[PDB]
RNA sequence: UCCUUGAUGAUGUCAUACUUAUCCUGUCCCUU
RNA sequence: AUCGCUUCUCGGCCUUUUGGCUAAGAUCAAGUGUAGUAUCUGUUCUUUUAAUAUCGUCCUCUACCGAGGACAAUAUUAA
């Protein structure tokens, strides 16, 4: 059951870019210790 | 489109800078003429649509219509587009909800979303088209359409607001020329009188309309509201990729009320121009007002020089009457403001070049003076702030006692007027491009109108075929055509008469058809070298040809009008035209498209004629017929056929249509060439049925064209019924939706295939292509040249060695067909050689397609053909004789199949590459892309009409062919109802008692169903027992197979596997059936079912099956109730024997006993109860449990045969409500034994 | 299918999205809004979401240019809004 | 022999001209063996001009 | 919101993409070639290989474009440099890099 | 044949060509060999598996496209590009006859023909008004019940007074795809209703519409009554919006005249084909290309034209009052009591 | 000094659920 | 105060950082159904008949060898 009501917390733009930040979709891991 | 839209923010800038530009002064004076304007006419204004109007709804659906007109042509729609035409149906199927929601725009929206811009380009000038949101347009096309008609009935706009809606651009011209010359002694120079015509322009009248002082008139015409509307409408922001400014200044053309805006503001400084006075003496009284070149009085024209005016939308036109006090005394008030002491007014004085030199405009002092001053003097009257009128953009004409001619240019022709009392010296009338137009009173031609076209209007066609020639999708050849019709049509039946009497525009004419057919040649790559054949452009799209029109005089070559026939003496070569004549010359379109004057003629006869007609058919009570109406349906002003629209009565509130068709350039992008009219108002206007007609009469009849096609190919026997299918190609939603049109460069040929397949026969000629000839693949097809999708066709035609089958299914047909003729002739057994099978596809030599081993000698007779007579003769040659089968391609230079068996004969018997056992064989030639066939070499006695009906057998009965045949016509996409394998349908019924095998197969009865209500109330259908019907019309015997509703088990919706397993149990019965008792024809009641048979007896290839036309009461048969009873309570399927002709056949013919079974079963499907009844009338007559119908004398029979034929005939009669004592006695056969 | 009420998630996804492609790339800004075009995304920017529309109250010379500027323009809202530095939207409603 | 050696130096074995001066290839070819086999307008004219003077 | 996310995150293309898992592959085969090959040296079977290329092992035989330094005023012919200490059993691929 | 258990069920996998004809359906290239010694003896992958008379059945059973399949394959990416000369589309298509993947022709064939196909018909067949046993089925409008077609009422609010329809049992799509009892029955109908509406002093115009076949519409024969008056000028207006219908620059002669050859023998089993009949005599027919420019109405957009009726009749219609407005079929069917056909017991 | 060789079976397989170089689309619902 | 180590704050380096051009290069859209691949869960091997295909001997041909034919049971699957 879904419920219609204004909510508390109003999310933002920079809430979705510090969400964004840590996505880390371009991050290559490190070579393994060899 | 960005270096205007800089100017165009450097133009709004400097206008919110710089102030008005209209100084308030000039502002007041125009609102102040325009108030004593409206109160001169009694003007009532328009109120806001009101909340029950009665009319709103027919504007709503003309607006949505005008809105749905613009996405027709495409296919491709953004999200846009979808919207829009999603908000046009919501307001389709509820308009009342739209209604409130426009008119609720209407009272209170005044700020808008911004509107795109771009430039349609016409390579000499570019168009503005304004992209406008859907619910804005939607409220904007019902207030246009609200505006104008309130407008119309209003009566707001003089008749010299020009694109009226009841005249064409050349009427409006027409009407223009006589009124010149129906003024009040308009050529008389003698006591010195000027005629001057000055054509000019409103220069920056869009650019220029002041959007407060335009609010400030709307609100003197229409409502605060509406006028708050299209002025703040006007105010929005135009955006073009990054570029945003706003329109503070100009207007909005693209606006769907713009229209009313323009013809309104131009209306305003006509009345600047002309004055109140002279105006108000032009529109006549309000109580009266007088129509378009009519005054009250004579006096009441000759009061000011001003005579005649007319506007069409920014262009003016004047006609001056001048005295030469008038004249002189503006021409000095001219030289006082502007002096020239160096006679330079002569300089810069523009004529008209298109004319000769004795037919354009002197060079007078005072003429020069006189058009310069009367220009001025006009100039004077606008102020440069409203508009500007400019000299290099107008044209001045004086006619004066040194000048014969006045020049003038209306609409995009132009054309001069000569009186017959001035140098003219010859009273002529020859030429169809001139007008001879009449004085009103005397009735006598006074002067003659000379029309040209003026060379803008021939740049503008020059320019649309410039266009046709881009846009990409130009590698279509019907796409091509088809524009330059349009654009042609649109050319000729605009100017009619004037095409001819200018000899540049026909000389660009025929270069833009080369140009055009270059470019389809060049898409067939063709070389530059010509004899291309023009019969496949010219050709109708019905016959497989482009359907291209003609204004050149092109011809066809003598060589093109050959065709040929083989029927059963031989092959018969027919001619077109053949005395000493050239005269093939294509039909050009001039002769076929009526000139406007005899348009103008006849068409108040036709409407005159038209009332008359209608006047005296209701007063005799009777509804009008086609064919009076057929008398002249092609005819009239408004042209008399549309009269029955679908809708005309929401078509009379479709007002000012004229000019929303000639802004419809600034909404939508497409450019038409009918901007001057539409068939819903205006009509066809044009016809070309004779053209056509005259077309393939000229290119050598219906015959003569189909020999340059494989119509042979595909083997129709006639022509008439054949359809062409463009809707199942790859032109589908894989292309459609196929994204990135670098697809469309390798596959741009593929939409050419069809059309290259057809007339194949001439594209690959060797006359044609100056080419190296190649081989194809595995074929005896040489292609010329590298036509881009032939290969293509001819391999999927002969896809898994089809020539190599073709020749070896004919090698076996002709063996077998020697296997069965041995005790005839001399023989001793006939032998297949087994060659390499690389001998079919090899023209150059061939071996021995068969050996035969005659018992003694054969004194042959020489070389002869096929279809030879006679002298038989020299040396006998024993044991041996060879025939060789060829198979040909040929194309239209050569398909003589003899003369290529002659040929081949005497290049294969006199060389060493090819080795025959014999010096006495022949060969058979056989043409696939014809289906031609012939013979040449030596023939033994015996063997040419064997032969002969041999080869008329396999041609028409062969396997392999069959595939051939029907992958021609698979990638041909041509179909046929109406020739087929040819039935039973009347004439064959006789044929069917002969001494061969023949069966009625009845699947009618197979799945039969029962339908009941369920608890849901739900009606259910279930199946029921079945059965196959299979009857022999010549011993009686009946087998009936029943089916059981089991096999049912795996559709039980459609079934549709029905006639399959009625197909297999008839293959299974007569795989059963031993080899004596096998059919020779098979003749099913249903045609569904001459697919599947023909599939499952392919084991069988003797088995002829054939289609009724003529259908019988088969189905009737199990309405018995021991065929019911012994159907329904069955549960195994099982073969039960009967005969149906109880014992008849002691006394009565197989015929007799058939007709009387016919008139049984008949009587029992229609006649039912009364049919037991009559047939079993008394307890004492008893019928046999081994037989069906009771035991009659001859006498009896009889009887009973009359009264069934009276029971079939009177109920026949009650169900067409027709008499049964007056019928003949072969209507009679028709209803008792098939159907009529 | 396009449209609608604009809650505050599109509007703050149309600001992030503004952030990342600019004021010039408004198709991929609106492939980063369903039910919403590229339209749309432009208007709602520039009519509720530019930092330079002044949502706050209107003081009193700017109602009196706004009613000088309206009795002598009349119905050009959109020419009237850059001069006294509202929206044409608000400014059509304050002087409603 | 000087325009097979010319084919066969550049290591195109799949190609064949035959003794009346037609180049055939004599398999199916990649997309690379027929970007690579190629010809221009000097070898095609000169196998031509020696095609007219076997004739 | 996480097509929103994961669209605000992406900056790279295909052939970024396609080239950082080369990478990753080209980095997972050298490892498994290092693992054969120190098998194969381990319990000791001296199979060699082949090379197909003009340049590249041009690198470690000797100094690539060599240009001498240019001599003058000072002799410099009796002074050397001492070599890096080898110590195979600590040493790793990360401490001839240093930190990252 | 093949199974395919439809959720319970079992559907024989069949395929229907262009002429509507059922066919019972049985069940990394490598660039195969299309040589031998220096000469070309092949260049489809199975030109040697085909027997002739192989090759007569696949032509009859052959659905009609043929160069669609290559078509679309060599259509797609990676495929190079057409030089000019010495590499067109005519050896691009040569080059393209590869090593089909182990019958794979086979089961794509198979998937589109049975997955495909008998999805559709189910999805047409549920939601059809017509077809008894459906979803919709308003089931009080039927009025006659015949031994393969009935007479039925529209769902909607019925553009004119005695509007009917001559609908048969089963999907069938068409009038050319009907077999001659089905026909022979629908006529029956007809020239009842005819001689119904006679006796009333109106008039008859039967239209049918069928569109693209490979929609999978039920057939439905209409029966739009009007005046005698308006009935006499019906010919007219039909003659006239045919000829100014589908697009311009036609090919296939726009205006068949069917008074007296007919449907059945005028157009070909497989194509649109628009017909018009008024009363008795046959009227005119047109052959449908274009399917964008041809409304799928055309026929009530006409009638309610020429009899001054809103344009939301035709399309879309109104819907009526579930069970109250919609026994207009109470007064139908006294109108249609001496001139039933169907029964005999009415002892 | 736990023993301490010249070497032709081992971990699988099947079913269900979630995302394409296939598959088919040019397409619609529902109340006043 | 001076020198050294460790917290803490801050300034300057931080272009060490947005690596072209064209018509903002252009355009702007989806749903359903099947097939294939991957993952998870559950449970199995080793130590008579039917259908299809084809080493010894004998004969003939050609220069001990080769080819052709005939003859003698063999292999697979199911109860
Ligand atoms: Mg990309
Ligand atoms: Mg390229
Ligand atoms: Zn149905």
């Known amino acids: 059951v879904k419920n219609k009501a204004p909510a508390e917390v109003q999310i933002t733009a920079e809430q979705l870019l510090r969400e964004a930040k840590e996505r880390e979709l371009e991050l290559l891991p490190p070579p393994p210790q060899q | 489109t960005r270096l205007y839209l800089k100017a165009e923010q450097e133009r709004q800038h400097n206008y919110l800078k710089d102030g008005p530009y209209i100084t308030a002064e000039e502002a007041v004076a125009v609102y102040t003429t325009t108030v004593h304007w409206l109160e001169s006419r009694r003007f009532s204004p328009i109120p806001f649509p009101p909340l029950s109007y009665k009319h709103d709804t027919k504007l709503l659906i003309l607006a949505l219509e005008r809105l749905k007109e613009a996405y027709s042509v495409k296919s491709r729609l953004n999200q846009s587009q979808r919207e829009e035409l999603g908000l046009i149906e919501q307001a389709y199927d509820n308009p009342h909800e739209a209604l409130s929601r426009i008119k609720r725009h209407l009272l209170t929206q005044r700020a808008f979303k911004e509107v795109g811009i771009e430039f349609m380009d016409l390579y000499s000038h570019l168009v503005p088209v304004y992209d406008v949101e859907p619910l804005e347009k939607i409220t904007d096309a019902y207030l246009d359409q609200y505006l104008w008609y309130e407008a119309d009935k209003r009566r707001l706009f003089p008749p010299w607001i020009k694109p009226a809606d009841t005249e064409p651009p050349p009427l409006l011209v027409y009407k223009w020329c006589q009124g010149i010359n129906n003024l009040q002694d308009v050529w008389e120079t003698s006591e010195g009188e000027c005629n001057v015509m000055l054509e000019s322009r409103f220069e920056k009248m869009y650019e220029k309309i002041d959007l407060t002082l335009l609010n400030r008139l709307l609100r003197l015409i229409v409502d605060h509201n509406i006028a708050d509307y299209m002025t703040a409408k006007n105010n929005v922001v135009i955006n073009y990729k990054d570029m945003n400014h706003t329109n503070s200044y100009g207007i909005i053309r693209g606006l769907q009320f713009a229209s009313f805006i323009v013809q309104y503001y131009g209306l305003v400084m006509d009345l600047l121009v002309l004055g109140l006075h002279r105006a108000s003496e032009m529109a006549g009284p309000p109580q009266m007002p007088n129509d378009f070149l009519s005054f009250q009085d004579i006096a009441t024209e000759a009061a000011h020089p001003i005579r005649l005016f007319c506007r069409y939308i920014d262009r003016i036109h004047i006609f001056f009457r001048f005295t030469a006090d008038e004249a002189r005394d503006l021409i000095q008030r001219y030289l006082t403001e502007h002096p020239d002491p160096n006679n330079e007014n002569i300089v810069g004085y523009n004529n008209k070049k298109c004319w000769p030199r004795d037919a354009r405009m002197r060079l007078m002092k005072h003429d020069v003076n006189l058009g310069r001053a009367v220009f001025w003097d006009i100039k004077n009257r606008l102020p440069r702030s409203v508009t500007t009128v400019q000299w290099e953009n107008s044209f001045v004409s004086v006619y004066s006692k040194d000048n014969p001619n006045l020049l003038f240019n209306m609409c995009g022709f132009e054309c001069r007027i000569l009186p017959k009392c001035r140098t003219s010296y010859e009273e002529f009338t020859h030429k169809d491009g001139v007008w001879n137009l009449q004085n009103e009173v005397t009735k006598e031609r006074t002067a003659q109108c000379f029309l040209r076209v003026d060379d803008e209007s021939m740049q503008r066609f020059h320019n649309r075929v410039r266009q046709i020639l881009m846009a990409s999708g130009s590698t279509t050849f019907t796409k091509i055509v088809n524009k330059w019709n349009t654009a042609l049509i649109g050319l000729m039946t605009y100017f009619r008469e004037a095409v001819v009497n200018t000899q540049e525009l026909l000389d660009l004419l025929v270069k833009c058809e080369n140009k055009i057919q270059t470019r389809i040649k060049i898409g067939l790559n063709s070389k530059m070298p010509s004899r291309f054949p023009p019969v496949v452009f010219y050709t109708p799209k019905e016959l497989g040809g482009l359907g291209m029109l003609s204004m050149g005089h092109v011809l066809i070559p003598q060589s093109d009008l050959r065709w040929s026939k083989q029927t059963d003496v031989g092959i018969t070569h027919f001619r077109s035209g053949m005395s000493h004549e050239e005269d093939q010359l294509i039909p050009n379109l001039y002769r076929y498209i009526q000139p406007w004057e005899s348009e103008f003629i006849d068409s108040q006869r036709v409407w005159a004629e038209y009332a008359l007609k209608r006047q005296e058919a209701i007063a005799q009570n009777r509804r009008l017929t086609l064919e009076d109406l057929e008398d002249s349906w092609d005819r009239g002003i408004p042209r008399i056929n549309t009269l029955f629209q679908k809708d005309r009565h929401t078509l009379a509130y479709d007002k000012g249509w004229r000019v929303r068709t000639d802004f419809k350039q600034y909404q939508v992008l497409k450019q038409n060439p009918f901007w001057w009219t539409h068939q819903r108002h205006d009509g066809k206007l044009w016809n070309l049925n004779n053209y056509r007609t005259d077309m393939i009469q000229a290119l050598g009849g219906v015959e003569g064209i189909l020999e340059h096609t494989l119509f042979k190919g595909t083997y129709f026997p006639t022509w008439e019924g054949l359809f062409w299918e463009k809707a199942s190609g790859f032109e589908e939603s894989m292309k459609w939706k196929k994204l990135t049109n670098a697809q469309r460069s390798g596959l741009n040929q593929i939409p050419n295939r069809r059309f290259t397949l057809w007339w194949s026969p001439t594209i690959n000629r060797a006359n044609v292509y100056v080419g190296f000839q190649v081989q194809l693949d595995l074929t005896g097809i040489f292609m010329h040249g590298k036509i881009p999708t032939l290969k293509i066709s001819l391999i999927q035609i002969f896809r898994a060695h089809l020539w190599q089958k073709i020749h070896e299914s004919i090698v076996m047909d002709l063996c077998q067909v020697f296997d069965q003729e041995l005790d005839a002739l001399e023989i001793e057994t006939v032998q297949k050689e087994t060659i390499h099978p690389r001998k079919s596809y090899k023209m150059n030599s061939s071996c021995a397609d068969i050996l035969l081993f005659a018992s003694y000698k054969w004194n042959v007779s020489r070389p002869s053909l096929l279809a030879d007579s006679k002298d038989v003769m020299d040396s006998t040659t024993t044991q041996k004789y060879w025939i060789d089968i060829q198979l040909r391609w040929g194309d239209y230079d050569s398909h003589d199949i003899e003369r290529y068996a002659r040929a081949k004969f005497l290049d294969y018997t006199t060389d060493n590459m090819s080795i025959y056992p014999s010096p006495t064989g022949v060969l058979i030639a056989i043409d696939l892309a014809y289906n031609l066939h012939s013979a040449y070499g030596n023939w033994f006695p015996g063997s040419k009409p064997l032969i002969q009906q041999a080869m008329a057998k396999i041609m028409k009965a062969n396997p392999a062919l069959y595939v051939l045949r029907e992958r021609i016509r698979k990638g041909l996409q041509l179909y046929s109802s109406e020739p087929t394998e040819p039935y039973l349908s009347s004439q064959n019924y006789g044929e069917l008692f002969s001494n061969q095998i023949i069966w009625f197969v009845d699947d009618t009865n197979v799945y039969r169903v029962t339908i009941h209500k369920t608890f849901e109330g739900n009606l259910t259908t279930k199946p029921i027992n079945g059965a196959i019907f299979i009857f022999n019309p010549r011993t009686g015997q009946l087998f009936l197979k029943i089916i059981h509703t089991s096999v049912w088990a795996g559709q039980k919706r459609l079934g549709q596997l029905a006639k399959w397993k009625t197909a297999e149990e008839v293959a299974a019965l007569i795989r059963s059936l031993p080899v004596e008792e096998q059919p020779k024809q098979i003749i099913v009641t249903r045609k569904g079912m001459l697919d599947p048979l023909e599939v499952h007896l392919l084991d069988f290839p003797n088995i002829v099956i054939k289609g009724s036309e003529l259908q019988l009461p088969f189905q009737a048969c199990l309405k018995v109730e021991k065929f019911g009873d012994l159907i329904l309570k069955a549960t195994e399927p099982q073969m039960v024997l009967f005969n149906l002709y109880d014992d008849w056949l002691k006394t009565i013919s197989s015929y007799t006993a058939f007709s009387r079974l016919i008139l049984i079963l008949r009587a029992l499907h229609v006649n039912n109860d009364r049919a037991k009844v009559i047939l079993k009338p008394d307890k004492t007559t008893i019928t046999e449990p081994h037989h069906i119908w009771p035991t009659l004398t001859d006498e009896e029979w009889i009887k009973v045969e009359v009264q069934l034929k009276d029971l079939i005939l009177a109920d026949y009669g009650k169900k067409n409500n027709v008499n049964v004592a007056s019928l003949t006695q072969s209507e009679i056969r028709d209803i008792i034994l098939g159907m009529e | ?96 | ?55 | ?100 | ?347």
Not at chain 4, 32 to 48: I, P, Q, T, V
Not at chain 6, 174 to 198: C, N
Not at chain 6, 279 to 287: D, S
Request: with cysteine; proline share 3%.
């Open chain 4, 1 to 55: 022999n000087m325009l097979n050696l010319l084919i066969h130096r550049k290591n195109l074995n799949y190609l064949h001209l035959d003794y009346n001066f037609n180049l055939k290839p004599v398999k199916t070819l990649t997309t690379k063996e027929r970007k690579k086999s190629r010809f221009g307008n000097a070898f095609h004219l000169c196998r031509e001009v020696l095609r007219l003077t076997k004739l």
């Open chain 5, 1 to 100: 919101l996480s097509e929103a996310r994961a669209r605000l995150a992406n900056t790279q293309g295909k052939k970024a993409k396609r080239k950082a898992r080369e990478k990753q592959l080209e980095e997972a085969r050298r490892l498994a070639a290092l693992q054969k090959r120190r098998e194969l040296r381990a319990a000791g079977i001296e199979i060699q290989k082949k090379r197909k290329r003009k340049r590249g092992v041009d690198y470690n035989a000797e100094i690539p474009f060599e240009k001498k330094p240019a001599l003058g005023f000072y002799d410099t012919s009796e002074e050397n440099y001492q070599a890096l200490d080898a110590d195979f059993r600590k040493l790793r691929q990360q401490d001839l890099d240093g930190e990252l």
């Open chain 6, 1 to 347: 044949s093949g199974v395919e258990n439809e959720d319970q069920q079992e559907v024989i996998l069949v395929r229907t060509d262009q002429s509507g004809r059922v066919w019972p359906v049985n069940t990394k290239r490598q660039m195969v060999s299309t040589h031998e010694e220096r000469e070309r003896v092949r260049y489809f992958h199975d030109d040697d598996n085909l027997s002739l008379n192989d090759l007569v059945k696949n032509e009859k059973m052959g659905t009609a496209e043929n160069q669609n399949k290559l078509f679309m394959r060599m259509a797609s990416k990676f495929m190079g590009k057409t030089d000019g000369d010495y590499y067109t589309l005519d050896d691009m298509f040569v080059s393209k006859a590869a090593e089909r993947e182990r019958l794979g022709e086979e089961e794509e064939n198979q998937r589109k023909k049975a997955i495909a196909e008998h999805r559709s018909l189910a999805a047409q067949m549920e939601k059809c008004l017509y077809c008894f046993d459906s979803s919709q089925f308003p089931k009080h409008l039927i009025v006659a019940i015949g031994v393969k077609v009935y007479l039925c009422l529209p769902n909607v609010r019925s553009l004119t007074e005695g509007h009917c329809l001559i609908v048969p049992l089963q999907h069938h799509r068409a009038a050319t795809l009907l077999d001659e009892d089905i026909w022979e029955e629908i006529q029956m109908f007809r020239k009842s209703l005819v001689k119904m509406f006679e006796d009333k002093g109106l008039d008859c115009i039967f239209l049918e519409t069928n569109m693209s076949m490979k929609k999978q519409y039920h057939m439905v024969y209409e029966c739009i009554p009007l005046p005698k008056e308006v009935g006499d000028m019906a010919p007219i207006y039909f003659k006239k919006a045919i000829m100014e219908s589908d697009e311009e620059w036609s090919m296939n002669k726009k205006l068949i005249d069917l008074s007296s050859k007919d449907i059945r023998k005028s157009v070909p089993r497989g194509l649109p084909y628009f017909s018009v009949d008024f009363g008795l005599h046959g009227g005119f027919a047109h052959v449908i290309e274009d399917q964008h420019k041809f409304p799928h109405y055309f026929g009530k957009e006409i009638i309610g034209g020429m009899l001054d009726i809103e344009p939301r009749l035709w399309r879309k219609g109104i819907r009526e009052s579930f069970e109250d407005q919609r026994k207009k079929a109470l007064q139908f069917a006294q109108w249609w009591k001496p001139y039933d056909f169907t029964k005999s017991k009415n002892y």
């Open chain 3, 1 to 96: 299918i396009k449209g609608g009420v604009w809650r505050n998630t599109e509007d703050e996804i149309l600001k992030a999205a503004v952030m990342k492609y600019g004021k010039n790339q408004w198709s991929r800004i609106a492939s980063l809004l369903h039910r919403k075009s590229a339209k749309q995304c432009k208007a709602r920017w520039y009519e509720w979401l530019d930092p330079s529309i002044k949502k706050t109250e209107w003081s009193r010379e700017e109602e009196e240019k706004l009613l000088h500027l309206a009795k002598l323009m009349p119905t050009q809202w959109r020419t009237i809004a850059p001069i006294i530095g509202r929206t044409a939207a608000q400014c059509l409603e304050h002087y409603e």
